[model samples]
Target: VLERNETMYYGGSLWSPPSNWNPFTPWNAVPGTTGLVYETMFFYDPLTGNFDPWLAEKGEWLDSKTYRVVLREGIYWHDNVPLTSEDVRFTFEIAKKYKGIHYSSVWEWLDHIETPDNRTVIFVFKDPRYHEWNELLYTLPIVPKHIWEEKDETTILQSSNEYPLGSGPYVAHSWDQNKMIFERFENWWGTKVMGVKPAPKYVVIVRVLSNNVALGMLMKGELDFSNFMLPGVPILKKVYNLNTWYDEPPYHLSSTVVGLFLNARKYPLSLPEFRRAIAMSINADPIVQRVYEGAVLKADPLGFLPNSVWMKYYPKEVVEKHGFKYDPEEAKSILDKLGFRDVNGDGFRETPDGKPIKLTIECPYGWTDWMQAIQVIVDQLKVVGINAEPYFPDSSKYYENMYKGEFDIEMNANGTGISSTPWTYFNTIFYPDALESEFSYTGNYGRYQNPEVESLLEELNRTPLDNVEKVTELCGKLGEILLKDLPFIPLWYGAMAFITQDNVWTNWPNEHNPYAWPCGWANWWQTGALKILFNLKPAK
Candidate 1:
């Protein structure tokens, strides 16, 4: 079916990859390299709730405050240097010293690292009861000491690592304005250590940002994988042998949960009753039916992905008891009772204090799904006598508007990590201190705050995850507050558009063999990505 030297072309788009490849500053690195190029000590399997030995052969807790890691044997860097415990020690030291965007916080509890031998490393923590120990252990990437040790902390932070050297399965071959290319490493350690051989010889990711162009590429034999939803999928299925993981509705529950974020920094939005009215006015069922075509589930109003692992925390009785339902009359009554009226005889209701209440809802251009969703939302709000208008701006300006609190309402997605919990999701948008700042960096564009929510989240973070009763209690309490407050109006959990072509490669995860969520972007980067990569095989 194919030649030995044939390359697999995978299609994706972003504005562009950053010039930097530094793992410390995750926001600036190229998409594929940021996650794929580096190896963590342990790989976490969420399905099993266990950590699989990866770079390290084994990790054992010697004591309450000490953990010992036995490194894998005979691993070499891309530059042919041997990987040893020295590299692991140096990585932890650098993370502590440099104060990276993500890892620096761990330094507070981490006391020191000891490398007893070439293959053995030990970690000592200040407190015996470090809460985020597992998360810290599995998340940080171990960098080579030989290369990074010579560089000063300030220089390392500022420099854009243009040519990254890693020991992963793929290495960057070349790149330009249009495309970036990666070739499978023939000397990869997985082949020797675990008998794992990568299936694809080459991965070519192009910089085509237009969704239409991406769809066309997938339709042809040019592309093998894509996460973008195929337009007119029902008709396309008749013509093309497109494969999504699912055979029917609610295709793939992607990590992103879409929500209508109301900026509390803006007038009337600060009122919980006003926000609740907006949530009540939205007709969510039709939005899911028409916009997503039943591919995505209408999410829980307090911001849990439908049918996700977090759904267990949101019990049916708890959520149904406090959640807002779709009722235009209820929304109008709430507004009317609150003294909002059409003082000028216009159809639109005025603000609670009799001020003119026209709101603008913004979404980025070229996001077809979001654009259609915003139109539907505007229509629904108008039915409740709210003067809601749709605004589509360029991506740059759209994000700028959100961060600066320039828009009244905006459609956005919050990503939950591999653990499938809403702790981080909730913290990102409603940290009490972050809400106080005019332009805070917590990604809470809405400027919504509840001290009780913050306290609960903080307590939850410090509590051991194994304490199911405490975790569930906190979640229920948080859910009650969130449902009552209505800081964000839930729309739908974004679906992974796992449309793939079977021309060159096969053995993709499907309904019968759903090993992983069928998403190219996620599978290339997230925690379970390595398993998918290792399991992929060439179709003869």
Candidate 2:
């Protein structure tokens, strides 16, 4: 603990100095804001799609409409306040009362909460959205009621919660311009509750100034783990014997889908026929082998990741009938048959009424792989006589225009983060409604509107998660609609770039070490970042 150079080092979550530390407002908080300090009731494993107990022993549905939970006893916050079911009750209800909390919509299904005792909680749902509840279990962090009850609705969100009083195994020690440090909590209840101990006394996180610099840091043993993308990792892994999830191709597990999100709000692009044509035009093989160099697997036509949890929901019947494979000739044939022909002497085609079809495919600058993929897509679109070009704007401008519905076909990946169900994947791109309201910041970036997909998801949300046959029927219909509509083309499976250097730390998560995940940023704690910390050991 005395020597900083000997501690475990992390990279690729923060870009600036530590400003905010509020766990509720995760987007603005310091990067790597996860369950290390604040803890969740249940740890949702993204790899296995299982909910393991943490603060809570386990949760079960008492009946069709009621769920009950029992909290682990003898646990206390870092401030020495005894944690209780009241804190859990306050945590979720406060989200309902506040405007900025991400899980505010939970109130839509939750009728009320009953905390009969300090150890037990019963949740009654007016309308059960079981799948979303599973997602919320690990995502929303519970805060001590004694600390938060004093803050008003506005201050609750704005306060940094500095040196947060959390129930997890590590607490913030210090932070500066580009680095944050956490020291192991000696009295962490997890030693008795979950039988695990943090191996490192100090864990230090620093901003990776550039992607290129991480490889050098890893080589010099400055960085123990890299959470950002490194392009030449395929070769670097072999030459340096770097440890990853897998030894060969697809060095990490599939995290999310990277796809071509077409803006249906614009003309020509608004047509379903035009969208299907675009899907058949762009080739994915080169993007898989050339652009990503086998680092990522191609996305499923049904819009699920290759991960086991999502793949089970794959609709074979739907994909067999509606899937689109790349063929520039077919794209031209579809457009020709639809009367979208060239009205002018120019090579590119026009709308049926003779308006020129000019489109720009976009991805933010500095996303090296997506820029390369956009080039291939633009080339293929040109081959099919479409007036297509590539555009690279600043990241802020790219996202602002996308959120405002002002962009054409743009590249989007990981909008649908890995979750317990496929509902997140379906809802992200083809949401029940528009994103102009409270959630204008997220979802349906392409402005895709399909009443059938919308209504089906609403029903799916209402249906109990245990209804396998009914859930299958609903998901199958939605899957078919997505494949037929082509609102977004599923391009490739995105993976978190987890590069571990064993020169200092050992027992990192890998294919053989299957204990926890290798991710440290975002809400990855339930995915097992905390477990990875406990698993790590000083090199022998």
Candidate 3:
């Protein structure tokens, strides 16, 4: 009696299909990418903040460097084959063969994995770096090893991998290039157990990119649910009764931020001071007001650790003392010091070699609002004599160009960190000379880096949270280091607004929780494909 719930949900995915469906590869799954590929670990939550067990029955740290993970017994693949620990080992090893999507969040610390029994597995870390260990769990989803071993590495494409088998509540039914349908598995072992709910009878994923198009679909009652659901809130409220949605699990403050992804590896931008200057020149508040139309909030951290439980270590006073500001005169002074000057005194700055400091800004072509935001900043940069322009390319070309490191400066919409720990943001994108630096991903298009910041990140990683006060102190220092170094200009925390129609009744979280409803796509992205299993009913 308590075990019955039927709901069908519809949503959108932003990117074109990846070159390959393998989650282990880097071609897909960046900040602006996701699709219907099944995998071994659920990645959306941990990196975004909420962390809990998924496929694994439970997890434990057997030792500082060793973890004992037990898979949920009796779990099976979508094809009804019993999932096993051997499958876990197989998945990781296979992903490795394909350069699996960045495993550092989870598997990077793992030196080796051993499956001694069908129901149990153990992992030994190469080092005692648990800084991102829990995060790895969400990043790595368990894929069926037996079925995918035949996937040839080179020829593997997204279509073949889209239909993956896993123990999630929903099962992949069928998909066209633009949309996919999911159906609840009657045999889903998770149903009626461990707080797991039954899958909806039907789930559909419509590939929609433009906000206006998504809005149109929502107004027509074609799409069942919306992510962020704030943008179209006013319009939806005007049409539908306010009783449709619930604000359960109140929203939490997110460190997620968006800004320029400068490629430091490129020309003129190859200089660190230029990057720092650009970071200082942009005003975050106006961007929030004009670009986002007040839908988002400014996300400048008082320090690197944020102004949450970890704020005492670094106070607002300290951050202000560091000279973080929109100072054109100061930016010019810094450029002059770095050998860039308004050589002819025309007020536009040029490098010693007489090259104008130009950067390219790119956003999703159809995100007219975001493009406008970039234009505002481009003008702001002009005031500082830094010539930056927006580059509007098709979504696919934009990503292709970005990944190939082809731009001078690129505006990136990125979720910074899931937790108070800054490494999720620092180690991955910045941290000088780090392998995955934005420089490489986006050509460090602005060549922004600070060795001291990297050292601080490394130090923060080693510092133990057991000494809460001590760690908090270090976090304060880390935040200060980032602000002073100016690797990225802190922009607003973009709001995820969505539009929905009348008559659809459902429960969804305003905050992000990788485990529950409003599954993925907006904040909980990994569950995008899985969320299709929800359907609305009469609001009793």
Candidate 4:
């Protein structure tokens, strides 16, 4: 049990000192800061499927092209500065100036933002579609204008911002290589205005890279939550209060798609038939059972969560009828018709051009499940007479090679759809000519392009989501292309795999109390994390 003054110990896999304070870094900023330190104007409630206004008290639409928002009064920054419309205005101004990877889309259609007063701000969009309500308003982090207004775009992008200040509930107190501690700000506006205060006085994130080391800490009650999977009932269950989002097998589902990203720019892979053949070769059901220990679901045909609200646009029956299934014989026939044959009498087949079709699949080292899945992939491809080998490289090297389009096939996961829609996922994965934009420096790494798919994405963006028939029709066309082309072959939906100790903390979001996101690992960093922090109370 924790003493009165002791901080609540939360375990995370990624913990490091502030390397870049700029939210628009080419890669990613520090792991824990986004929702924890700097908060957005509004956040999406996954349970209710409604926008929860945090800093902004309310938002009203003046027209389809204009929206008005009023800031919550009495909000103060960590540095004791009051939060107002100026801060919000400055945040977007800098974002427009720098055009960071994530925020660039937010300002793309903006006519201008007007600050009528300290408490009021109005946005006038050139063309405000319904989806832009979520994209432009909900996704952006409102930074402190007083601190950032003086800094140049390059300086803001490059600075480490060690002692950063934010208006959120917690402050970064201290840190080192082993752990990072965040102190709950008693003066936070949520306590006074919203009747919300974090139960734990402090949040201590211990840096244990190894899952075994973290699990050991969890068993001993030194940790409250982990970012990795936990041992199931009969073992660790007896020691700790084990909780996954779901009650049974395939415990929790994060809105993420784990897939095999093939390099379309490479030889023989550019062919749609070749890509479809590869998709049919592997069996995902076994991978879900063995590699994920039955804690994940086989991916949807369109590679997005079928149960989500966005599923209204999903073409279910069409995909189920025409989609690739695990048929190794079908895989062989596709390859055979594509002119791949074993001319030299060896087991391995040659490409259409008569070159050896020996391929190498690359995944990050120490990713145990992915490594195991790749071996299964290699074995399955061998049956179709394609010589496939597994390559393990350090994570940094793997990403370096992957982003450069150097890998034949790579294990990749996209988190774009987790935020209540799959429109962003399509933008990230299938958006044509991504290589031409600075925002896509690391996006569309597979280098697949389709002009028609690009036009469909633009149509989806322009059309309001309220037009369900139009959205569904466009999505069906898009899904057909995704199924046919196979830029990234859908493997499985990755589970959040959260484990928590209820001895110290209680009232976690279970099936009964599914008010907040149940997975603490993701919940801690996502839109709902702050709400969960406030809702949590010390166990009696």
Candidate 5:
């Protein structure tokens, strides 16, 4: 039996039993299942906005059209087998071969891949996304060629790699019905190459039943780290030694912006003037203070997170020209100009043709903070003489309705995570090539389409990654368009929900020592979560 002192426990994003362990099958795998077990070419730092070496020793562009990576020597899979450049090439090849793969679009820009040696892999591009290449490095998890190559297409995508063999710091040692224990990989390459080792010899990840239950666990010293939004941290910090990134307010690091995504296909919402009025009616202060408990702040009018990496493109002049703010008076004025008035004297406005507009805004059930945010929005919207109701559906139906564009407005943010640049947030506003097909696998769920937006997105993708000036210019134009168009209304910025206790482990990330982002959700793989594992020390 592993001693509790040596076993580090984690909670949040694991609410069900572990049935499948396949990293390729994203839906069934446990949270932090991929990068925590497998390996990526590099690890990205949110603070420095840099990609550090992991599997690959070094990577650089040979020319504007060519990119190459030199794999580190002496790296081995968990099975004590050599993990070579073939595995790296094979991992990318799977994405290229499978059209259903999310990143299969890499093939669109790439001419071909050349593997000259076991350590060398070169990419020749028809259209280089040097910036997106940076994004791919930290995300594309390399699969073991010797193992995955033998499987059929369906097996490759669907089979649970339960008895996993990875080139990462931990090995999937064992799992039961409720939890999984990861044993440290003695031959982990970091020890030899990077001179670092994870503090915990064994990592035990348990399914989080609920926030209150996890809070109880924290008080009793049963839970070491949690990314869940648990309440009563202010009192717990002193009484039970709990801690967050900050001491006073917004206790976690802000990660992304949660916005009210309006379905542009719906009437009244389809009108840009109506959308602008809706934006003016929303007051993010109440959402920030009352609901999020200072864990969030009002978002910038442009809708990307206020991170230094992305916000560098914030065009103060252009935004000042096109941006807006919360003003119910202005909202009422816009509606009046648009010919929507309270003709029926019911106090709520009616459309130009006398049709009453009763809008419904949705958030998934069990999202306590989001539900409150919606309620605040509904109340504010009513003040502007717009009739609106808040709706809560279970997560399953909520996502389906959103993807199908079945709802008038859906409160969404997770899909549009922060990438290397402002591309994701802008793309979310206007990325769909055509609205012919109506599912939102890659966002733009509102089904808002503009040829100009599509052109800029292509231009953004084609522009040189390092050319900051051009990127800034493009992002500024996009932001201006976003503010002027208002396809979706920017609401509030959200954090990673990172709250930790030093009961079993200490040295968790805070603002002073933000060595790694303490996010353990799906994107934990990309946010340098492994660095957190390397940086922690057992509680004194």
Candidate 6:
């Protein structure tokens, strides 16, 4: 709901949600916006940790190179159009033609998608590509080609076709700049199916409401519910009365880590010793304690991924063989040996070229407190004669250049949810190839390219969960290499807190669950239940 611009299809950008009710052309779900519209193939059941197919009848891989997908038989598009194999085939073909990540990474090796029948879809690989096939389930949302068939591939469809039909539960009832109304389909395909429940009659989304406004609405009974953040623990403690829902740990999603995004293309960042020196200087635990007031968790400051058993497999042998750890004197000694010195006796370090080693570390608006935390980190680095300036810029300008890899250093947040899997966050941001793409937010700000690291990431994705140990070992090696190399300093991980009504109850959302956060096919009740808005009696 931030800003809607037309691009490729009914959904436009790959990240954009479906503009209409059309299920065929779906955009991958965004945190809050995604839940209101589309649903993915498999929904995760937290109790069992298994995936249940929504539109997909069955999903399995034949081999490392081949993936077979079977769609459900009785599914219908939101427009009442029968969904068939051709729709699936068309989706992949267009995706491949457009060089979607799925097509580029996984299916790039595939010869062609073979649709043997309306229900079955088979993809054959041209070479050994890894988990790219999973892109369909994880990233790519299927779009119906029938609507876009008449238009040019590059040209965005016009207004008359702006809101097409969808396979999702709701349709676009009204559209204003800020408010879009989604009325549930009385004949949604899920309802008549064997086990699905009826879709909600009112799926309303008020575009871009602030935390305070959303919170106010909830308190006044104007809104039914929200997951976390504004309604987080801090607010919940103060606000009383009414029902609420939240998790016990509240740290269900990924951990929120605040760290400096070192632009590798920059001078000091490119220098290995400087990077290592910085990495060894700051302590993560104390930072977490001081800032979060113990609400935060202790994590590997130099390690983005948390302390998991898989970390042991992180090529400990390779790193230990070389020896990597936090050593302040060694860090200072490295700086001294590297010829950086406080030539003016100003207590601030300067480079060999006699240039002052000073650069602004950008921080976004609300991050003022964390910026202070980073200042503490810089204070320690001063022990090595290195000085960093903390600069606060407007949020838009910050992201504009940050996405383009324009900063020397900047503080940012990543790995935001319950899951520690760095797959999406890492792939989305650090992936070197993504730097050039407009869509990529984290484009290896530091151009630290290690072929081994790249190969290891690819291998990790291709390797199944059971064989993850081998990959973990490799990642540990990469982690030590990264930390020691100081491409980016690992910092503390934070959580999203919420305040809920006293009578209401909720649990932490599951990462694997399609319905967890916004509550999709598996937990439709979340959407319906929240509609208790307007129905509630006065605060008595």
RMSD of each: 3.4, 2.8, 5.1, 2.8, 2.7, 6.8
For model 4, how big is the CA root-mean-square deviation? 2.8
Error of 4 at 259 (Å): 1.4
Q: Model 2 reaches what TM-score against the true structure?
A: 0.91
The clash numbers for all candidates, in the given order, read 0, 0, 43, 0, 0, 47
Q: Candidate 4, which segments miss by more than 4 Å at Cα?
A: 1-5, 12-18, 231-235, 238-241, 343-346, 401-404, 437-442, 519-526
Tens digit per residue, CA lDDT, model 1, 1-88: 2343356666543435436567665544555674456777877654444677878999988977788999999888889999999888
Displacement of residue 40 (Cα, Å) in model 4 is 0.8
* Candidate 2 segments whose C-alpha is farther than 4 A from its true place: 1-6, 15-18, 157-163, 174-177, 232-234, 337-346, 350-360, 387-406, 438-442, 464-466
Candidate 3, position 352, lDDT: 84
Q: Each prediction's Cα lDDT score?
A: 0.71, 0.78, 0.56, 0.72, 0.78, 0.52
lDDT at residue 264 of model 1 (Cα atoms): 83
Tell me the spans in candidate 5 whose CA falls farther than 4 Å from its real position: 15-20, 25-28, 150-152, 157-164, 173-183, 342-346, 353-356, 433-439
Candidate 4 residues 159-195, lDDT tens each?
A: 7777568887788777776666777888887689888
Cα lDDT of model 2 by residue, 1-540, tens digit: 347444788886665568777877775566445587888888877767778988899799999889898999888888888899999999988888785666687787799999999999999999888777777787778888998887887887678878877888888889987688888888988887788897878888876545667778887878887776777666777787677788887887777788877878788888899998988887788888887788888865766776756565666777788788877798899999999998787888988889888898897765667788889888888888887789988655776666666778888863566778878787787764454443344567778887677678878777776677777778889888888888888877877778888877888888877777677775675577778877887886
Candidate 4 least-lDDT 10 residues: 518-527
Q: List residue ranges in candidate 3 displaced over 4 A.
A: 1-9, 17-20, 26-50, 95-101, 104-109, 150-162, 228-236, 239-255, 301-318, 336-347, 415-417, 431-459, 473-481, 510-519, 522-540
Q: What is the TM-score of each candidate against the true structure?
A: 0.88, 0.91, 0.81, 0.91, 0.91, 0.75
| Cα error of candidate 6 at position 167, Å | 1.7
TM-score of 1: 0.88
Candidate 4, residue 369: the lDDT equals: 71
After best superposition, candidate 1 residue 148: deviation in angstroms? Answer: 3.5
